[PDB]
Amino acid sequence: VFYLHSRLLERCAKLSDDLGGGSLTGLPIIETKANDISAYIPTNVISITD
Amino acid sequence: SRQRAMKSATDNADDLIKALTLMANRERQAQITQEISEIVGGANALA
């Protein structure tokens, strides 16, 4: 599951000037339960994003 | 009044400690059961 989300989100990038200079900004949304920000998928995704 | 109020607060903190300890023991037992469920689920998936 970490590989799932990490390879999904790592494709959002700011390209170099030789590659066109395009951008893909990412807004993943994660719903916690009972404010448990320290669950499995929440902590997986918090460590992937900027 | 301060003596009476502090005795009341001591009894209240006692009851709160008791309830919190009950909840903590429930969560401890639940954590052990859930961990065993995951371990046995993996072991049964591989068997």
């Binding site: 790592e10 990038a13 902590t43 460590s47 | 371990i39």
Partner: protein, 469 residues
């Protein structure tokens, strides 16, 4: 002939059948082909297990999307090899030894296998020399070790990458030896930032960068640390001069081993980790070391999953380290940076015989005051600062000022606050904290201790508030 045949493909794990007498050894690299034009590539497969009946279970280092069962698998006869020598400095490498900075570079260097045994026990010697950084909290409470093992523990998003870039700035810039940085299962934006920033600081020419990032399959994330370790081991054992090794999230290594564990047919351990957690962590961490006369100063970032320091992975990483800086999200939420937990962090050379009587005594008094403040925080939250003793109120004021003075404006954090960074000598740190403990600044507000340098910055920010030291 002596060729193999793909039999099963389950994600990153590939089963391969060989003819009798041609079974490849464990850890051998094998080559398979993916001919689909959109994904055409050459898969490298590391032999992980001998399954029996001539079968072999391997882990792929590239994604196996497009792989067909039955294709030919070539045994290369050796493990994964990476280039070694002085020529790897100044370039960015793959987990396989391919140069990204300049494709085709290093193909004719000497190549070392990434799988080694650690140095013999009769070659190890304890390191007890202080490495001075300029950070008040590190210099005072977790002094680093020349040629020793340093770690940065922390949950997701506290200070680890910023702190390790700060230490690359402080330790590696005016350094006289070789640096090796291993990006292990981290962000590619941060790797590009580090590459560009080393290039501008004119320090990239002394650094070898090896990246395997989060988008890679678990095989690359398992082996990239071994590749960078092999480069650092060459610089230690052959060149013989003062290596610096930085590994960003060694935990990812461990995590990669747990992504393929059940696919390799291993019953899971306690918290979902592989049964061989401590054994693999030990066979890797025992190569990251200094021998007698051959120094490697190591600095690793250790991700603490879900902020839980009792998690098996950091809990078994703890035993491999000489100094540990532990970052808390509770300190992070209060705005204190670096978000070091002073009561959970440690160092083996924080000893009167190494750092001196005054250093040690000031550190102990700071720790005692912070511990008493932690003990009083609950009463202060419920009952208020008024129901404390006069001595306890004095200690609480001193402790708030101390915990704010431990923070610092870091060189690598100017991109977050706009304020430039500060370097504080260790003698100034010790003297300032001795004054704080005695109570010489009990009249200065809590602010003016926050994100400053030494005592001169303290005076300036106090007078900018209407105070005098």
């Amino acid at each position: 002939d002596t060729s193999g045949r793909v039999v099963r493909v389950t994600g990153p794990v590939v089963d391969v059948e060989f003819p009798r007498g041609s079974i490849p050894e464990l850890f051998n690299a094998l080559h398979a082909e993916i001919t689909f034009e959109s994904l055409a590539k050459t898969l490298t497969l590391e032999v992980a297990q001998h399954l029996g009946d001539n079968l072999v279970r391997t882990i792929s280092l590239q994604p196996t999307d497009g792989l067909v069962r039955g294709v030919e698998v070539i045994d290369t006869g050796r493990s994964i090899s990476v280039p070694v020598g002085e020529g790897v400095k100044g370039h960015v490498f793959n987990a396989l030894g391919d140069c990204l900075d300049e494709p085709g570079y290093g193909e004719k260097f000497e190549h070392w296998s990434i799988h080694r045994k650690p140095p013999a026990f009769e070659e190890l010697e304890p390191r007890t020399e202080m490495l001075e950084t300029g950070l008040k909290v590190v210099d005072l409470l977790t002094p680093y070790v020349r040629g020793g093992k340093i770690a940065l523990f922390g949950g997701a998003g506290v200070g680890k990458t910023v702190l390790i870039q700060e230490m690359i700035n402080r330790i590696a810039r005016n350094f006289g030896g070789t640096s090796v940085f291993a990006g292990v299962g981290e962000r590619t934006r941060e790797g590009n930032d580090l590459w560009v920033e080393l290039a501008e600081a004119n320090v990239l020419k002394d650094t070898a960068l090896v990246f395997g990032q989060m988008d890679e399959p678990p095989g690359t994330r398992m082996r990239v640390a071994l590749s960078a370790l092999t480069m650092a081991e060459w610089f230690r054992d052959e060149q013989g001069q003062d290596v610096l090794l930085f590994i960003d999230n060694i935990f990812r290594f461990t995590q990669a081993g747990s992504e393929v564990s059940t696919l390799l047919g291993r019953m899971p351990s306690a918290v979902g980790y592989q049964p061989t957690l401590a054994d693999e962590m030990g066979e890797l961490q025992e190569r990251i070391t200094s021998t007698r006369g051959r120094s490697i100063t190591s600095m690793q970032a250790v991700y603490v999953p879900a902020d839980d320091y009792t998690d098996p992975a950091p809990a078994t990483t703890f035993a491999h380290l000489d100094a540990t800086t532990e970052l808390s999200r509770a300190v992070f939420s209060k705005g204190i940076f670096p978000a070091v937990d002073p009561l959970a962090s440690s160092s083996t050379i924080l000893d009167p015989s190494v750092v001196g009587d005054e250093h040690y005594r000031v550190a102990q008094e700071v720790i005692r005051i912070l511990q008493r403040y932690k003990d009083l925080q609950d009463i202060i939250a419920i009952l208020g600062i008024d129901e404390l003793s006069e001595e306890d109120k004095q200690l609480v004021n001193r402790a708030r000022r101390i915990e704010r003075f431990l923070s610092q404006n870091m060189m690598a954090a100017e991109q977050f606050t706009g304020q430039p960074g500060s370097t504080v000598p260790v003698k100034e740190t010790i003297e300032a904290f001795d004054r704080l403990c005695k109570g010489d600044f009990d009249h200065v507000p809590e602010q003016a201790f926050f994100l400053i340098g030494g005592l001169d910055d303290l005076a300036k920010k106090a007078e900018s508030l209407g105070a005098k030291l």
